[PDB]
Design a protein around this nucleic acid. Sequence first.
RNA 1: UUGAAUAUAAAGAAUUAUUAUUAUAAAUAUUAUUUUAAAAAUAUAAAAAUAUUGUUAAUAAAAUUAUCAAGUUUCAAAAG
Lengths: 56, 101, 176, 214, 85, 140, 113, 95
Amino acid sequence: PRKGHMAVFRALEVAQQGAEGKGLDKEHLRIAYITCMPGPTDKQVDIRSRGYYAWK
Amino acid sequence: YNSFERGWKDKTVHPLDRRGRFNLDEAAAELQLDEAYVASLYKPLHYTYSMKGQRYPAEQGRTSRPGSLAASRDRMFPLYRRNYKLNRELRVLDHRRISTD
Amino acid sequence: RKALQSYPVPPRARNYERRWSSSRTNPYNRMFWRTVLNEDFARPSFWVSDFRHKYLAKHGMDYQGRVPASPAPGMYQGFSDVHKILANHPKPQRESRHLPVMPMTPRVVFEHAQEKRIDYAKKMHRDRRLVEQLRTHEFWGWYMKLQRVRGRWCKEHGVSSRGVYGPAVDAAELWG
Amino acid sequence: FQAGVHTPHGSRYNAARMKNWPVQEVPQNFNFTNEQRFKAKAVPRDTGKIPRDFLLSVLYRNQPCEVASLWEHCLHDPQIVLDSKRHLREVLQQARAEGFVSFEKDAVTDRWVCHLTRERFEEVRALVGARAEAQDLYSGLRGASATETSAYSESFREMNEDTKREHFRLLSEQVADTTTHLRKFQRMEMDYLPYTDLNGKVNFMWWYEMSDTR
Amino acid sequence: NACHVPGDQIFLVSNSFTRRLLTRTDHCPKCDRLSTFRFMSVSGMVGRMPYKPVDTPGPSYATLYWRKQRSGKIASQPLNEVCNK
Amino acid sequence: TAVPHEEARSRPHFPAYTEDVDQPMVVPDGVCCFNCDKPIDGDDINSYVWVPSGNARVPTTQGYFFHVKCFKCWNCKYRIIHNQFYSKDSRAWCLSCALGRDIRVPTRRWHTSYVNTHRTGSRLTGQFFPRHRHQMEFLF
Amino acid sequence: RSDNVAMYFVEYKNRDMSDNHKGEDYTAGPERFFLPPRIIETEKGIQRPPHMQMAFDRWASKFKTEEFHHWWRLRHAKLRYWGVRNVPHPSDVDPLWTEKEEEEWHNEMLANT
Amino acid sequence: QVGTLVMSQAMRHALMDLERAVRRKELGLEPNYLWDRWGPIGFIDGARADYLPRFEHNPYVDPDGVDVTEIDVLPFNTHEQIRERYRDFIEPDTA
RNA sequence: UUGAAUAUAAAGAAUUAUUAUUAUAAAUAUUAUUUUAAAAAUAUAAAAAUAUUGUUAAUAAAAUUAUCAAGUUUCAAAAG
Ligand SMILES: [Zn+2]
Ligand SMILES: [Zn+2]
Ligand SMILES: [Zn+2]
């Protein structure tokens, strides 16, 4: 029920959906490198108690 | 919740008040009470008379978006348009009733 | 804080003070016993308590009668906000004989705007039951159709609706 | 209600039988323990219209009536809808609280008399009217030879001259013997069913028809 | 424990129908129609409170005096039955 | 009530839900406005201010009756301030006028009192459950 | 999906001996929540106790109006004020029940005709 | 307009008190017209003056069951149909 | 509306927060935002025999209760 496993499973149905076009097998296909890449990080204002703010 | 996954749905809408289907204007005809008025009894008084009230922002309807036309607060919620005849007739004091000269 | 002179009628509840006194409600029923019991408490309201000083001078007596209320037409004509140099009565009239008419001060009109919004409220409740006296009134009338159609169906299908046993456990009129 | 369980044997009250309830015999050895005598949660009796419409038509006939010999009258009506002495008393509590009947100890005696209260007295007079209005329809004599009982019209009118109080005396036992023959060949069997109103008060809806056995 | 336009009844209320408690709609037998009842007083509880006897709240000194009139002096009618069938 | 003393309620000063099983306390049929005299709706409504002055009997089978709009002082014609009225010869008079005083206009609401409807404001007082010596309860 | 609470499917035992749920199917929930549940086609020839299926549509009758179709439209504004992800705007929430879905059922009460 | 008088609310409550005085002596009773106790000091009876744009929560009530309302006086618009209807009251007596 | 003109839903605490903004008016809408399989502390206390201040700087002005929630008394010091 994790989120990380549902995000990658969104790829492993799209990637192999594109892999089968490249000729790549649908069956014998492996995951060689599955790496996370630090990406965009918004800055949200948070309002802590007693007049202190700390940016989420 | 017969959902198996709760959400903005499968939250059983009225797990009580099983006596549904009230024909107000039909029933209002038996009481002889101005069908337009009776139906107003059964929605928050903000929605019909000229009263101070709190509206949700989606309820307000958005400007013409690239995805959707200008959806005015009325054409999506017809039975919430305030009826200012029914307001004035009931709630405000007419010049007539105090005309002295 | 929204000076009381702004409200159409001075406010009903009047908050005060008193760090060492915590109670919202003004103690009425004490402001009432005084005033009803003691005549002097409330200023005479000039007219009804003038008209002496004008009978005594012109008649040589105490009036010794109930003074008319509703000050005579023509009295307090220069005054503008009488409301105190009177009871809360209206400014009496011109010095005329035309039928009495309320000089529609901003105050009188507001009272009209209450006695219409009192009739408004008592009317939105009076008929929220009048239709609640149909919904539940007709829901029962319909529910008894249900127990009738259930009453008819539960005889041909023979479901006694009284447990797994036969009526021989009922006829004992025990628990069993 | 069975013969020997709550009640002594032979007390098979000859009134409206309940439907489907098999009357079975219990050996004359039976007795509860000193505590089971008391648990014994009975079955609740109908006290609705049809008994309260039927009881009052009795107490409208016998306007002042000693309570003791009251039950010996409801047995006599062809339309007895009352299962046993217990059902009568519970209806008699109902009709008491309704304001219909009003018990008064018959001062000259030590027995109470179900007096139809003057408050709702003019209601039962109309109420006994409709049933009689709707009862004389059924009889096969009312309509076949109406003149057989046209002999009764004059008599009873001139009967009320000399012996009206003594006429019906014999008429009272006469029907008491002729309603029993009926009550051997047909009874009003009461089939009931529970039901729960919107306020969660489980109660029974009833109805009554006449079972033909011969 | 509930009355009427002119009459009375009695009923123990659950948790589920706490809404209908103050003023119910019911068949008023001193009439033939449903009529609004009120809540003239309490007559106990619908279940046990923890660690308490069967009559935890107790009906009342009041609803007892209503009972002692209904069942009470039935001496007008131990005739036609007492408790038997 | 009977409630000898030191047994009545203390903080709110009165018990909620006066039980009245002894006498049913219903609105009568021969009922009429004290001030106006027009017949009053039987019980389907709270348009009437039913003041049962404890056990009254004299004003009606039960206590005085007034439609909410007939609840004004008859003599001065304004509201009955603080709701204490003075039944002058079968027409409720304002206590101050009925007392001889003359200040004859209030501030807040002139021609309609602040009263509650259908005894709901009068059930702070009068006839709680043990009216009289009901010792039937403990006796055999 | 809203938390790792497990979901068991508690169902009463044998329904083939029932009278109300004789041959119903529960592989999927009713389409609009006021619509009666899909039936096993092998036993499509089943009718119900009337007091059960005449009081149901008494209840299901309130969602077939437009005042609920306004409370439906409206609720989708609440869930957005309370922001709940993936809630369509109340401008494209065309009703659950409709006139095209009226014609079948009044003509599905051919029993009382 | 030809002769239809612009009747202020005060009037349509002065024409009610006149009409209620007519109906009374049309019922045969004594027509206690309100404004014949009205003198130079106001109500001669020493009563609180009844001011005419009368509140709807203080409607003049006579315990004799006389009905006068807006439906009544609206046709009495022009000058002529009052000088004949309420002739007997608006006209003073010179005998 | 039969008035010329004029204008009618939404705050403040930094927020969609503690939060009935009480100017008014009454009085049964079956008005509708609160995750979840445990024991420690802790916030907290239903329940329950004895004991009654030995605890402590010092018990007793210290939530609610249908078992209906209230200690009495004396002395000394102490004005409004
Ligand atoms: Zn009743
Ligand atoms: Zn009145
Ligand atoms: Zn007065």
